[PDB]
Amino acid sequence: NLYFQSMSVGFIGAGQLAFALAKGFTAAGVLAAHKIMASSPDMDLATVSALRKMGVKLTPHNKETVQHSDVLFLAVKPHIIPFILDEIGADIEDRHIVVSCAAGVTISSIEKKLSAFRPAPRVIRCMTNTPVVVREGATVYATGTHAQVEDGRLMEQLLSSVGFCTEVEEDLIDAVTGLSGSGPAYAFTALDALADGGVKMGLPRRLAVRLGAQALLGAAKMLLHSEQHPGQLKDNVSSPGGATIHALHVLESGGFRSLLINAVEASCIRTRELQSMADQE
Amino acid sequence: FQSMSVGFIGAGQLAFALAKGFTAAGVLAAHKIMASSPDMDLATVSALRKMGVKLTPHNKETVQHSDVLFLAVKPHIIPFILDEIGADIEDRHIVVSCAAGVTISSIEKKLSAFRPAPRVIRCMTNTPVVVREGATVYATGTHAQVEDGRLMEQLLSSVGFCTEVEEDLIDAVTGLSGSGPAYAFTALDALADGGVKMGLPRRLAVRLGAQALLGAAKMLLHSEQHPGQLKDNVSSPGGATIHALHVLESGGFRSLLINAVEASCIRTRELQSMADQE
Amino acid sequence: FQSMSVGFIGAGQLAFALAKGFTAAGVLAAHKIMASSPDMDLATVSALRKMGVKLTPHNKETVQHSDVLFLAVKPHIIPFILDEIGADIEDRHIVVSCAAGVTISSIEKKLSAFRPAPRVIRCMTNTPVVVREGATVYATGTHAQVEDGRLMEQLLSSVGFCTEVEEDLIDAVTGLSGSGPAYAFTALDALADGGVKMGLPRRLAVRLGAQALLGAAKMLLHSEQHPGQLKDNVSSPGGATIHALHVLESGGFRSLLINAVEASCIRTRELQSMADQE
Amino acid sequence: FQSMSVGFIGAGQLAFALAKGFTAAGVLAAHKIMASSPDMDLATVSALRKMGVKLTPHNKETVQHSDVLFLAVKPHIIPFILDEIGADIEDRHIVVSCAAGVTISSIEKKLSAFRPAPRVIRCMTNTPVVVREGATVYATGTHAQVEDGRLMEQLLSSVGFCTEVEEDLIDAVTGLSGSGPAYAFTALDALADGGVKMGLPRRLAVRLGAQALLGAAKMLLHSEQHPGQLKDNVSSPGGATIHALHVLESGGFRSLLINAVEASCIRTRELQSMADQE
Ligand SMILES: NC(=O)C1=CN([C@@H]2O[C@H](COP(=O)(O)OP(=O)(O)OC[C@H]3O[C@@H](n4cnc5c(N)ncnc54)[C@H](O)[C@@H]3O)[C@@H](O)[C@H]2O)C=CC1
Ligand SMILES: NC(=O)C1=CN([C@@H]2O[C@H](COP(=O)(O)OP(=O)(O)OC[C@H]3O[C@@H](n4cnc5c(N)ncnc54)[C@H](O)[C@@H]3O)[C@@H](O)[C@H]2O)C=CC1
Ligand SMILES: NC(=O)C1=CN([C@@H]2O[C@H](COP(=O)(O)OP(=O)(O)OC[C@H]3O[C@@H](n4cnc5c(N)ncnc54)[C@H](O)[C@@H]3O)[C@@H](O)[C@H]2O)C=CC1
């Protein structure tokens, strides 16, 4: 029974993440689509067309998003953030809460830009993922220097309506990016391959996709609802000498676990490397 | 309002998961379920008992109690079971075998020596029925009535996805969604290790990794888009995700999952070939 | 335009391919093209002559003839060429650099020492322009006029795909479509070896393999569907194609192609840093 | 001929692709084509209807309509189909089996039980016939007339490359050009991932990669030169392309493509031995 009646939300950038969050928020019923505005220099993108059909207000001008909004999501690529902040920094008012969703971009770098125009900008950094579109996102956030206590509580209330949300120290966010930010892509890759395996063994593709995705969804839910270690839940599936333990062995023989560790590491490291380039630039 | 009595021959992991799912769905009262095992010292048996399920060592009592009778013992036990209680199967019974690899033909051959038209259904499910997100398929036997298949689909749809298949798909289903949760638990453990390696507390890394997988699976189930397209929507040019996807590809990540589904399916077939040789 | 004169500094593989494509397309008569090379006894020089292209050893002659001037020499020769003809560039000239890696900045710096505001365009194309199926991108320089980009796009579209990009994408395009034909020739040689191993005559295996790759590429270009969806359409359950796809996955086939694009792009960037260092 | 009526038993991917190609080519009006499938609520069935193709659930109707009858069902359904329509084949009919692996011998044996001297042709094609760039081979049966092969070659040439082969080459052709589009779709997906990793937008990377592969394939088909010579032409000394070729070689890129052709051919042979065993 949550609803932010006095909240106007804006998105700078009207791409995949802006669509995903706007769809999640509106499906959650916590925001009316007409209370959301999004801006982009390309009003002929597929994401803009979808936002328009939801009822979201669209404009090419970032200043109009700022003037309309109370909560301002920065949903542009990381290298575009500094250009955006210089463009609308003079338009940031006392009432604004600036929420950066950009991978890698630090609170410090955002506050430095905006503070040149008006002291004490209220900044929150978040990392989320596309499953907010089905209200099953994984979101962490960190509060900036001038964010009020109620700013973080409000953002946690808003982002909890589209999935899991918790506050973290900012120095964890690049690692979260490599785990749950990039995580859905790992899962889509795994599901494509599991379906290929189903097809190889005789299943129609449509059924193999549905079963593989259902298997992954159910296993993730079991772990989230259980206090047992993932190894114990695994032991419950595998009968002695059975089909599952035979399959687990061939995963182990290929270093399956190490590949997923490799992936989280590589995404985290790249996130740190890109920001180190941005700060040197 | 069915007042259906359900029995499980076998009181292990699957019987517990199904019983927990059915009672949480509200389709069955726990005390309308009876389960039998010769080993009451199992943890699964104590959980079933705590739920309020009726427990007995005697498989005949389970049969006489049941309207729908699940066979939840290990595949090599099924023929012993059918010899033992085949005389107790009645015309009213629907026999649902959950055993990996065991064919409808092998079951009907045993039971037909007693009464002539045993109603047999074969199913393959998985442990997430315990949270009502199972993936279940079933095939109907020679004498199963149209209403038997519909009843079975109503029942198993209460604990997750359920669909009828031809029996010759079920071994492949076993390798995919039957064994699938174990592949996911392995992946989630490793994803969490990667989170920990990069500085996350273990508890948070497990939570985030599992939420990521749940969300991605739901996205795919709710999308008409190809999983490759959903993947392309995550990865921006030059970005973190595409760098991570590259290291997965360099290890043959896709081939490992194909290998797993194949290995489980083949083992399922190989066991049954040895079973029907005996 | 019809009255448009085109020149090539460098009369080698790329100049031949572009001139063959342009004249085959009908957008340029061969007699409107001049090419220069210091060795007039070259195979490409002979081929260009037979087509009707004007040839000369003097790069100054090419400049004086041309309106649109392509630079088709190896990248380390570009600075030498610019110093040789810089005093000969007029305001009518559009200088189109085809050299891998060489930046508009480096070209404009050399030419601006002679006459301010050189009109420079940088492009990256590939040898299939010779059969009018090239893949070309281009970026406009500081003083290139809007019509200059439109003229270049009209010209290069006659021999394949052409689109404007920001210059900072061109090194990656080089690794993908610039080097791409070489990846395909390697793949076609190996696919033909596979056909021969399985009993096909070499000539038939080459023809079938090349036709399969051409057809598949055209399907993808004409489809809105994801390449994985088109792949799914071809793989029947249990069939030959999904069996072969597995062995590709088990070798990390995908990661090798990613490796190749990356290695070509990185080498392109490295060669240009070496150029700028001096 | 114009008065030629064509039928498809099986209204799935292949039947759609051939009918789309035939009608796009102008060799057949859609109203001269009938296709049959037991599920008239299929995506391919709908698409065929919009094109103007006559649809029916009755395979007998297709036979009665057709002069040239394509068999486009899965290989394990061919014997069932032949038993269903065998009594309906006339002397006017040319039966063209597209099924992977299925021998002319097995088809002629089933049809000869109903009427002697069935005119049978076996072909292997691929889905790029949908854009008129297929690769097709065919072998003529015992009672096929000389004009029957010439008619089939004229028809299939309208949608791509077509040549007659001895039947014992067709399983290897299946592994090369039959499965080949799937190898190319995998390669194009991975090449696009490489472009994205190096900073290209996904849509541009897909377009460039597909255009590069199409252009290279067309170059090879139009050249008399060896694919290694064309590769040599593209690799400048010390350059980006030869650096990328090295990383392909270091992964055994060539051996993976050989592996794939082999695995598809062997699986084709194995499936047909399973067919003949029963
Ligand atoms: N897609 C994902 O999986 C997630 C993305 N993010 C972050 O969200 C941000 C956007 O991600 P996507 O939405 O995937 O990018 P996207 O590329 O789909 O959308 C980017 C949007 O920015 C717009 N844009 C470019 N220049 C602009 C300007 N000067 N002013 C306003 N808009 C401008 C583009 O037109 C486009 O609509 C990135 O910083 C990314 O790291 C964070 C979590 C997950
Ligand atoms: N655990 C899983 O993930 C799934 C298992 N299955 C199938 O379910 C069946 C059992 O699986 P689990 O429950 O995991 O095995 P489990 O080993 O946990 O329990 C097996 C039960 O059979 C009982 N049992 C042994 N001999 C018996 C007899 N003569 N009469 C009655 N009960 C007897 C054991 O005491 C134990 O309670 C197997 O056929 C397996 O293939 C199917 C889907 C998934
Ligand atoms: N062939 C390819 O695959 C593509 C090549 N390119 C670029 O095009 C340029 C040339 O490529 P290729 O034609 O393959 O090289 P190539 O070596 O076949 O031709 C080079 C030509 O430059 C001539 N030349 C050398 N010094 C000269 C001078 N001082 N004045 C005039 N001409 C001189 C040589 O005599 C030769 O005719 C390179 O920068 C390459 O990066 C770009 C697109 C694709």
Ligand SMILES: NC(=O)C1=CN([C@@H]2O[C@H](COP(=O)(O)OP(=O)(O)OC[C@H]3O[C@@H](n4cnc5c(N)ncnc54)[C@H](O)[C@@H]3O)[C@@H](O)[C@H]2O)C=CC1
């Ligand atoms: N798609 C490809 O890549 C190529 C396929 N082929 C061969 O063509 C045949 C079909 O290929 P796809 O069209 O990909 O299969 P598909 O599964 O897309 O279409 C199969 C069609 O057969 C229909 N069907 C099933 N039982 C039937 C029956 N009793 N009577 C009539 N129709 C029935 C199905 O309803 C479906 O419409 C296979 O033998 C395959 O080997 C050969 C060349 C290339």
Ligand SMILES: O=C(O)Cc1ccco1
């Ligand atoms: O691993 C085994 O044999 C049991 C099983 C069947 C399906 C999933 O697990």
